[PDB]
Amino acid sequence: KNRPNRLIVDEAINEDNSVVSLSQPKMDELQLFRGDTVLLKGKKRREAVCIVLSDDTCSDEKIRMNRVVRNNLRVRLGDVISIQPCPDVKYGKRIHVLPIDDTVEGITGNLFEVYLKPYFLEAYRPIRKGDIFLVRGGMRAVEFKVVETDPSPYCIVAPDTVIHCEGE
Ligand SMILES: [Cl-]
Numbered sequence: 061k062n063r064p065n066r067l068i069v070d071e072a073i074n075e076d077n078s079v080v081s082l083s084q085p086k087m088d089e090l091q092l093f094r095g096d097t098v099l100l101k102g103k104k105r106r107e108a109v110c111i112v113l114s115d116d117t118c119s120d121e122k123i124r125m126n127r128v129v130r131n132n133l134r135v136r137l138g139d140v141i142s143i144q145p146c147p148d149v150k151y152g153k154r155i156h157v158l159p160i161d162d163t164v165e166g167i168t169g170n171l172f173e174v175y176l177k178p179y180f181l182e183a184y185r186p187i188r189k190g191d192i193f194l195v196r197g198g199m200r201a202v203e204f205k206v207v208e209t210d211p212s213p214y215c216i217v218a219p220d221t222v223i224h225c226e227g228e
């Protein structure tokens with residue numbers, strides 16, 4: 061019983077889509093530093109790639125995550141996920157995302173300048189093929205699915221990372 065890399069999901073205080081949080085003893089045990097990329101394994105064999113931060117109100121065996129990640133992981137509060145470091149992870153050459161058209165009227169107009177540039181610029185966000193993420197944009201949030209990454213199947217969107225969006 062007991063394992064150090066299996067943890068119980070818990071609601072996050074940080075709503076940033078790329079962030080998960082652990083106690084400091086936990087990070088120190090798993091030998092992780094703030095900014096480190098982790099692979100999370102959830103239910104229905106869904107996997108996510110996150111940035112891990114230290115939270116001091118976090119129980120040594122809890123993991124706080126926003127629901128964008130929980131949803132990507134197909135888990136809910138109190139479920140159990142597996143966490144591993146992701147050292148080999150690389151800066152992305154290209155990424156292909158498609159925006160989710162949920163509404164009549166679709167969405168306009170330049171998704172790149174309005175959503176993607178502002179969302180990705182800054183953060184060196186880690187992403188995976190098949191992630192669904194939500195950008196709080198002008199007028200309305202928009203969701204995108206990650207169609208693919210080069211390199212596949214996951215990577216860090218860097219400032220020189222090419223980002224193609226369907227209609228663009
Ligand atoms: Cl592409």
Ligand SMILES: [Co+2]
Pocket residue numbers: 156224
């Ligand atoms: Co293309």
